[PDB]
Write an enzyme that holds these catalytic residues in place. Structure first.
Site, mmCIF file in Angstrom:
data_model
loop_
_atom_site.group_PDB
_atom_site.id
_atom_site.type_symbol
_atom_site.label_atom_id
_atom_site.label_comp_id
_atom_site.label_asym_id
_atom_site.label_seq_id
_atom_site.Cartn_x
_atom_site.Cartn_y
_atom_site.Cartn_z
ATOM 1 C CG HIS A 96 -2.370 0.491 0.779
ATOM 2 N ND1 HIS A 96 -3.474 0.309 1.584
ATOM 3 C CD2 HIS A 96 -2.812 1.146 -0.321
ATOM 4 C CE1 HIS A 96 -4.537 0.831 0.998
ATOM 5 N NE2 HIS A 96 -4.162 1.345 -0.159
ATOM 6 C CG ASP A 119 -6.294 -0.736 4.824
ATOM 7 O OD1 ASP A 119 -6.125 -1.714 5.572
ATOM 8 O OD2 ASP A 119 -5.363 -0.143 4.250
ATOM 9 C CG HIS A 121 -4.087 -1.792 8.884
ATOM 10 N ND1 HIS A 121 -4.205 -2.834 7.988
ATOM 11 C CD2 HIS A 121 -3.754 -2.351 10.072
ATOM 12 C CE1 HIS A 121 -3.959 -3.973 8.610
ATOM 13 N NE2 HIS A 121 -3.684 -3.707 9.876
ATOM 14 C CG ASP A 123 -2.299 1.877 5.574
ATOM 15 O OD1 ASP A 123 -1.974 1.215 6.582
ATOM 16 O OD2 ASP A 123 -2.676 1.362 4.502
ATOM 17 C CG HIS A 136 2.599 -1.519 4.507
ATOM 18 N ND1 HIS A 136 2.109 -2.802 4.363
ATOM 19 C CD2 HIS A 136 2.966 -1.404 5.806
ATOM 20 C CE1 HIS A 136 2.179 -3.435 5.521
ATOM 21 N NE2 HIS A 136 2.696 -2.608 6.414
ATOM 22 C CG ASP A 227 -4.906 -3.259 2.588
ATOM 23 O OD1 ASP A 227 -4.821 -4.478 2.342
ATOM 24 O OD2 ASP A 227 -4.151 -2.695 3.405
ATOM 25 C CG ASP A 229 -5.127 -5.484 5.247
ATOM 26 O OD1 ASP A 229 -3.921 -5.264 5.504
ATOM 27 O OD2 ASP A 229 -5.989 -4.578 5.239
ATOM 28 C CD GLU A 272 -0.276 -4.254 1.699
ATOM 29 O OE1 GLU A 272 0.408 -5.297 1.777
ATOM 30 O OE2 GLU A 272 0.219 -3.120 1.876
#
Ligand SMILES: N=C(NO)NCC[C@H](N)C(=O)O
Ligand SMILES: N=C(NO)NCC[C@H](N)C(=O)O
Ligand SMILES: N=C(NO)NCC[C@H](N)C(=O)O
Ligand SMILES: [Mn+2]
Ligand SMILES: [Mn+2]
Ligand SMILES: [Mn+2]
Ligand SMILES: [Mn+2]
Ligand SMILES: [Mn+2]
Ligand SMILES: [Mn+2]
Lengths: 313, 313, 313
Positions: A96, A119, A121, A123, A136, A227, A229, A272
């Site tokens: 990312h 995501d 996260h 980030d 990332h 992303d 994840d 990712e």
């Protein structure tokens, strides 16, 4: 609309190397063919050749700063070109950290863009708040105007120029946010729908609110940074930092089907995907297959079905 | 209410043969006993003896037309009888092509019936729009009045007579619809809730809308044709054409608990259970167990609990 | 707030013995450390030494009545103490029969408490309605005032005194209720949200209604008795009586995050974790990890993130 595929085989934004194979496995899964099987005009700009930077010691805690900074600089250029060719950029990652270049290049052609970040996260760590040093987990801090002044001069990013404001982005799927990142969230008033908001309102209300928040005042280009994840690891296990309690396959498809329907999708990131982390060969195909499904939804594939403008009877 | 079990060990509506064992495994799971364990009066009409039709070459692309047509003709007769005996018909399949006979026989006794079709597919291809030639993906086209004239004279179905209108049916769970099928959906204005609508509104709103749409003007008999692949393959893997992103176990039970509460359930179909396709013995029991659970909910089994009209204290 | 950990290694409320290891595996998972990693002041009152009662023949059908009654009597005392020390009691079970002592001791210090019972079961059978004889399925009948008079004089419980009314408790997650239990539910007008209500309204509306129902008239202490089998066995398999179609990991975290936000959590029970029933070592860690996650949410851990009252930039 018309699509411009860009491969970004880059992994230096984090520790696990297998993520640079993302473009490879996604293409091998027949992504270009599937897209064409739809009403899609696709042009593959190939995989960006990310030159090796042997001399790249950490900037304080931040790892591979020059490699990451240069990769995003190269990507920004390619994305700006595809956008200038009147095509929706589709960046296949890659970790990312590449979001820095993808969103930067996209904003050069469309400064009024809005970002939807799917995501687990945020980030949004800065080079000074991060505890992992993995870039990332910092892309957003480099892009926000309100944070310019909190970002040190990190080797490799002198080309960057904050292109979006705190109010031009919406997060969906959050479930693992660092303390400093949460502080920035609340301090800048960033709009987000963590897994808690998704549970509370339901994905339908979440998308209604997201698109209204970003397109209310006026219509503008949308950049979707996805992303993998962000979705639960039961659907996308082959990824570097999986977090349980994620968005379901259905919710992932709902988000994208709704974004497609706006007719404003302008830039897309599928990041990712790391085949090397699949505990089994099936975990790999499961992750890649889900990534492809999400991508196809972004370009029109609907669960209720699709049909040509002809009389089938 | 009072139940009339009918076994339909038929598979020629599709390619995989193991589906004709559905009645067997469902009965072996104690379905009749479980139903009786409830306030249910059950009469087993046995398994219909579907005679072998050795001479049955394809009609154009359509496979086993005479075998399928005759099986539905036989079933239509049995269903009409059980309905005349004042019992709710419970057809254990068997592939979905049998829906032609089940709904046809049901409509002979109750022409004002409404249909709720739970499935990942619309099964509304005509003999001319189908690309697979499998009749289990065409039952609905034979039943709709608006389509009579688009259905060629296929060997084995001269007995059929369209018994329902486009507005007498509602789809729930759709996620794999062919182009022509989608064209028919939009052209005839058929009411459906694909997985996209389920995600958007939530199963509660979906059932509220479904039952209101079908029972609004006036109360009428309900025919529930339940294809087990309507539910996610994590719950019903042993089926011919599984599609990820399906209805959950809970949603499946919610749909049926709500239908039961209407007190209008008149006909029921539990189709597409194929033990031979279970990757493991557990996948088979998992599919059969879920199929039984769905069936029991249709007849009163509630998750909040059930109790006799007595003083337990 | 301030926490008081109490270990209750007790299993005689049901047949499977491994549940008395719950405190052990939960502590070994770093629960105390994780709690401290948060803004939590934790004091471990240790594991209650439940003396062995060799002579404990069944009272009619009810098994180990003296062992169960004494264990709850001992726990009630410890909970009352921790509550008097101004700490939120956290009881690590142990089978659910312990709820009798935990809620009893809690009510001695806070008679106006309200109870939220997360479970697939109502555990409201009386010694006379139960068919299993397992006391972990009867705790609630001993606590309800409206039922005092329907509870025989069972050896070991002469110390009990009904401390809550039917209207001071709300059930969430029900999916396996016995006939008599359902009769009591409807007869006493107990508020519940079975899995059917969760499907219908969504967990957000469920929690909104639950907290409004219990805190509407006025704010009062909340006692959360969390049975891990309330969540789907795909998340907590190592438990004595798992029932499919349970609450998801997300819903479990949503329930607890919302309860935490009330700032009224006063007593908590994490019950039915049985490591010995994990089909694999992973099933055990999966159950324990989920149990820890639920516990941490009860004390502030939020999915959107958490941050200290400092300027992170
Ligand atoms: N995969 C991701 N984000 O998408 N990892 C980021 C994790 C952590 N927040 C960090 O800054 O290192
Ligand atoms: N199992 C099913 N439907 O329930 N298959 C149908 C698939 C495809 N639509 C066809 O016509 O062949
Ligand atoms: N694990 C539980 N409840 O939480 N079992 C209770 C089951 C049954 N209702 C009984 O009374 O035995
Ligand atoms: Mn992530
Ligand atoms: Mn990310
Ligand atoms: Mn189907
Ligand atoms: Mn079908
Ligand atoms: Mn339970
Ligand atoms: Mn319990």
């Amino acid at each position: 609309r018309t699509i411009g595929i860009i491969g970004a085989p880059f992994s230096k934004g984090q520790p696990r190397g297998g993520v640079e194979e993302g473009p490879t496995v996604l293409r091998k899964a027949g992504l270009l063919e599937k897209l064409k099987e739809q009403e899609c005009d696709v042009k593959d700009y190939g995989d960006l050749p990310f030159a090796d930077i042997p001399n790249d010691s950490p900037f304080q805690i931040v790892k591979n700063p020059r490699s990451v900074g240069k990769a995003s600089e190269q990507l920004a250029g390619k994305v700006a070109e595809v956008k200038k060719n009147g095509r929706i950029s589709l960046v296949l990652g890659g970790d990312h950290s590449l979001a820095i270049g993808s969103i930067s290049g996209h904003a050069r052609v469309h400064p009024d863009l809005g970002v939807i970040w799917v995501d687990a996260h945020t980030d949004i760590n800065t080079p000074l708040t991060t505890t992992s040093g993995n870039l990332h987990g910092q892309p957003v801090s480099f892009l926000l105007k309100e944070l310019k002044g909190k970002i040190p001069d990190v080797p490799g990013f002198s080309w960057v120029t904050p292109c979006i404001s705190a109010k031009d982005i919406v997060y969906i799927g959050l479930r693992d946010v660092d303390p400093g990142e949460h502080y920035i969230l609340k301090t800048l008033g960033i709009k987000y729908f963590s897994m808690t908001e998704v549970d509370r309102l339901g994905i339908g209300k979440v998308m209604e609110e997201t698109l209204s928040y970003l397109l209310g005042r006026k219509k503008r280009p949308i950049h979707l940074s996805f992303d993998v994840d962000g979705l639960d690891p039961s659907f996308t296990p082959a990824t570097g930092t999986p977090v349980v309690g994620g968005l379901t396959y259905r919710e992932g498809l709902y988000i994208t089907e709704e974004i497609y329907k706006t007719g404003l999708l302008s830039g897309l990131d599928i990041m990712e995907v790391n085949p090397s982390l699949g505990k089994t060969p099936e975990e790999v195909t499961r992750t890649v297959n889900t990534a492809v499904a999400i991508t196809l939804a972004c370009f029109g594939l609907a669960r209720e079905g699709n049909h040509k403008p002809i009389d089938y009877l």
